[PDB]
Design an enzyme around this catalytic site. Structure first.
Site, PDB file in Angstrom:
ATOM      1  N   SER A  77      46.215  59.290  44.230  1.00 14.77           N
ATOM      2  CA  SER A  77      45.189  60.301  44.291  1.00 14.77           C
ATOM      3  C   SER A  77      45.740  61.432  45.110  1.00 14.77           C
ATOM      4  CB  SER A  77      43.904  59.762  44.910  1.00 14.77           C
ATOM      5  OG  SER A  77      44.178  59.019  46.091  1.00 14.77           O
ATOM      6  N   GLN A 143      45.073  44.618  41.116  1.00 13.24           N
ATOM      7  CA  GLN A 143      44.962  45.372  42.364  1.00 13.24           C
ATOM      8  C   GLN A 143      44.497  44.500  43.521  1.00 13.24           C
ATOM      9  OE1 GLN A 143      42.393  48.668  41.352  1.00 13.24           O
ATOM     10  NE2 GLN A 143      44.096  50.023  40.765  1.00 13.24           N
ATOM     11  N   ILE A 165      30.794  47.187  40.403  1.00 15.01           N
ATOM     12  CA  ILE A 165      30.212  48.348  41.116  1.00 15.01           C
ATOM     13  C   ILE A 165      29.061  48.943  40.326  1.00 15.01           C
ATOM     14  CG2 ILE A 165      30.524  50.672  42.089  1.00 15.01           C
ATOM     15  CD1 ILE A 165      33.218  50.109  42.872  1.00 15.01           C
ATOM     16  N   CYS A 310      51.190  64.086  34.869  1.00 13.39           N
ATOM     17  CA  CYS A 310      51.574  64.906  35.990  1.00 13.39           C
ATOM     18  C   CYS A 310      51.464  66.396  35.663  1.00 13.39           C
ATOM     19  CB  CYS A 310      53.010  64.553  36.418  1.00 13.39           C
ATOM     20  SG  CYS A 310      53.223  62.828  36.913  1.00 13.39           S
TER      21      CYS A 310
HETATM   22  N1  LIG Z   1      33.661  50.185  37.639  1.00 14.00           N
HETATM   23  C1  LIG Z   1      34.495  50.024  38.652  1.00 14.00           C
HETATM   24  N2  LIG Z   1      34.233  49.051  39.590  1.00 14.00           N
HETATM   25  C2  LIG Z   1      35.082  48.866  40.649  1.00 14.00           C
HETATM   26  N3  LIG Z   1      36.195  49.666  40.781  1.00 14.00           N
HETATM   27  C3  LIG Z   1      36.460  50.628  39.864  1.00 14.00           C
HETATM   28  C4  LIG Z   1      35.624  50.834  38.778  1.00 14.00           C
HETATM   29  N4  LIG Z   1      36.146  51.850  38.037  1.00 14.00           N
HETATM   30  C5  LIG Z   1      37.284  52.277  38.635  1.00 14.00           C
HETATM   31  N5  LIG Z   1      37.480  51.517  39.761  1.00 14.00           N
HETATM   32  C6  LIG Z   1      38.552  51.630  40.752  1.00 14.00           C
HETATM   33  O1  LIG Z   1      38.557  52.983  41.180  1.00 14.00           O
HETATM   34  C7  LIG Z   1      39.856  53.518  40.998  1.00 14.00           C
HETATM   35  C8  LIG Z   1      39.834  55.015  40.669  1.00 14.00           C
HETATM   36  S1  LIG Z   1      41.395  55.803  41.162  1.00 14.00           S
HETATM   37  C9  LIG Z   1      41.016  55.884  42.939  1.00 14.00           C
HETATM   38  C10 LIG Z   1      41.776  54.821  43.735  1.00 14.00           C
HETATM   39  C11 LIG Z   1      41.975  55.057  45.232  1.00 14.00           C
HETATM   40  N6  LIG Z   1      40.823  55.738  45.814  1.00 14.00           N
HETATM   41  C12 LIG Z   1      43.293  55.798  45.453  1.00 14.00           C
HETATM   42  O2  LIG Z   1      43.396  56.968  45.116  1.00 14.00           O
HETATM   43  O3  LIG Z   1      44.281  55.254  45.968  1.00 14.00           O
HETATM   44  C13 LIG Z   1      40.526  52.652  39.936  1.00 14.00           C
HETATM   45  O4  LIG Z   1      41.930  52.631  40.071  1.00 14.00           O
HETATM   46  C14 LIG Z   1      39.922  51.299  40.204  1.00 14.00           C
HETATM   47  O5  LIG Z   1      40.680  50.635  41.197  1.00 14.00           O
END
Ligand SMILES: Nc1ncnc2c1ncn2[C@@H]1O[C@H](CSCC[C@H](N)C(=O)O)[C@@H](O)[C@H]1O
Ligand SMILES: Nc1ncnc2c1ncn2[C@@H]1O[C@H](CSCC[C@H](N)C(=O)O)[C@@H](O)[C@H]1O
Lengths: 333, 339
Positions: A77, A143, A165, A310
């Protein structure tokens, strides 16, 4: 479409010079802007109201690669580049430190990382604050596995939960809830914020980072029949692009305490660094993709997928000196 | 200190009505332009940050720091001393009042049997209008002026509107054990400071499923204490003494949702208030026969009566130029509905 399909095929094979790809991306972004902006502030405000009211009618809903493209934190991110000479690894740490500062993390607090990715933030606060109790939440087995293994490293204060979630419930209460670039994948922010809010202790805080445009908000849906760009990295309908002000409109259950924005140059540079690491390492990436996939062609396509990923991030957020598409930080209570 | 003497003379001449309207307008535009250069920021991050400084700074403050026969000449028949709504180039002030009042009733979603609170009611245009349209509504008006209270009660009686009640209060210190289905605030917040304390106080007066409707003037993008940019700024204090007002951003009260929650947001072009002030200026100028003698018999003598004329001319020209600036797309009005 057939012109679109021919370009897409050329991009898959890596036959388009980067200079040409950026030029084509800018053409699409220019069009997004003309479509996004209104002649009247009344219309501009009305458009946000359209999107927020209809969202309210909806429902909520490989590691050796990552270690190459990302910095050593595996932050997938936006990173923070003060200074022209800031490196990716410095930019990850700076962004992570910034979250701690803005979200006001303190040593003995319970901390929730909602959508933890892989999971730079949870591991970061867990190591910095040994008396914090840090919970990471994700819907990915892979993960969850990695953060658990990485938590040793001898970290005793990390817990990972594997949950959706969207549908998840729990009794627990947190002093600090951190959401980094999750909401872009959600829809009904009213129901989402209501769930999360039940998880915040009475004196706790919610900290949110989201990408945005500074003025308008939209379903990341192709503009029209020759917008090849909106669906070049994500399938349509999977993402929303908020305005900087968006979540000021969702304070039924939380209340905004602070609001910052960061220039798009940061996320633009982030992607730039990711792309450099990709292109400097095809010697190990290609064989890796070839093994993971079946053959040469599919491995070549995967590479250019990541390139487009990218490049999309580079030009979009870098557009007009990072003064159109950017990051927004919001702290709620 | 040449600049400064030039300013005291310009004010001297404006006070005696010696400067042509078109020159006044040009001069106002130069101040407005400097305001815009001062308020807009090179980066959005700085723009956002400028808002926060203000909202955080206001939370540190306290809640806070005219003959009717004159008003009947210059205002429409509703004596609405705030923005009116002009559709069509042909729309008259009286119609723009009505249209605006009806817009309040719709966006505030008033229903016929509700209790209604008009906070800071001026001459009672909204309370009188609501009480008349919705016969089963109990309407309560609030003001800190005994003149306005007397006038509104007398118009109730005359118009036969028994469902009107006027409370005499300072909203700054006011407390009551009452609750209202709907609360209307038309352009009162510009005179307050700590919006967190004010909105907490008001939120206590809303019943459980009630709504709060707010109109306020604003700039599109930035927010500020109405104080002189610098020593060359004669305009910011041309009408109101300094520190008495705040120009919010369109989005400003979005940052004060501790106790209320925004349901809807709208904005109106600045052209509407600009035309409002233009109609007011027209009426002031076409009725000097009455107004000058009325000012004379109310002031020391004849000179004071003239500077009072021109003070009001300044009131309208400020309003005209500011809200009409850049075709009504800089300074404008904001409607916010909360629950
Ligand atoms: N429905 C869901 N329930 C739980 N986690 C989710 C989700 N949809 C997406 N995610 C999580 O949210 C992430 C979005 S990317 C953000 C990841 C983190 N904040 C970073 O940047 O390092 C995904 O990779 C996944 O891990
Ligand atoms: N401290 C206070 N307590 C109660 N009323 C106040 C007040 N300060 C200002 N007011 C009221 O707020 C008004 C601001 S002008 C708005 C009046 C009305 N809404 C209209 O549009 O016509 C003043 O006329 C006065 O009646």
């Amino acid at each position: 479409k057939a012109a679109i399909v021919e370009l897409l095929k050329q991009l898959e094979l890596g036959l388009v010079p980067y200079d040409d790809i950026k030029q084509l991306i800018r053409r699409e972004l220019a069009r997004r802007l003309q479509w996004g902006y209104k002649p009247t502030y009344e219309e501009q405000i009305a458009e946000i109201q359209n999107l927020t009211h209809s969202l309210r009618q909806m429902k909520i809903a490989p590691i050796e690669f990552l270690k190459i493209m990302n910095g050593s934190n595996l932050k997938g991110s936006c990173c923070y580049f003060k200074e022209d000479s800031t490196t990716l690894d410095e930019a990850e740490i700076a962004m992570l430190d910034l979250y701690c500062e803005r979200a006001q993390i303190q040593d003995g607090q319970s901390v929730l990382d909602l959508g933890c990715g892989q999971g730079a933030l949870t591991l970061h606060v867990a190591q910095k604050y040994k008396n914090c109790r840090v919970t990471a939440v994700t819907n990915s087995v892979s993960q969850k596995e990695y953060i658990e293994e990485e938590s040793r490293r001898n970290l005793l204060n990390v817990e990972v939960k594997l949950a959706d979630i969207t549908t998840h419930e729990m009794a627990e209460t947190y002093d600090r809830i951190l959401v980094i670039e999750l909401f872009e994948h959600m829809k009904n922010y009213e129901l989402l914020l209501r769930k999360i809010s039940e998880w915040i202790s009475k004196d706790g805080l919610l900290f949110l980072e989201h990408i945005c445009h500074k003025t308008f908000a939209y379903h990341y849906e192709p503009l029209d029949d020759d917008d090849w760009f909106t669906e070049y990295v994500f399938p349509a309908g999977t993402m929303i692009i908020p305005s900087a002000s968006f979540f000021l409109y969702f304070q039924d259950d939380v209340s905004v305490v602070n609001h910052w924005t960061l220039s798009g140059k940061h996320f633009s540079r982030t992607n730039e660094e990711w792309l450099k690491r990709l292109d400097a390492n095809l010697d190990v990436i290609k064989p890796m993709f070839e093994t993971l996939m079946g053959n040469e062609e599919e491995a070549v396509k995967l590479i250019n997928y990541w390139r487009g990923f990218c490049l999309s991030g580079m030009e979009m957020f870098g557009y007009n000196n990072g003064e159109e598409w950017m990051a927004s930080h919001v702290l709620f209570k």
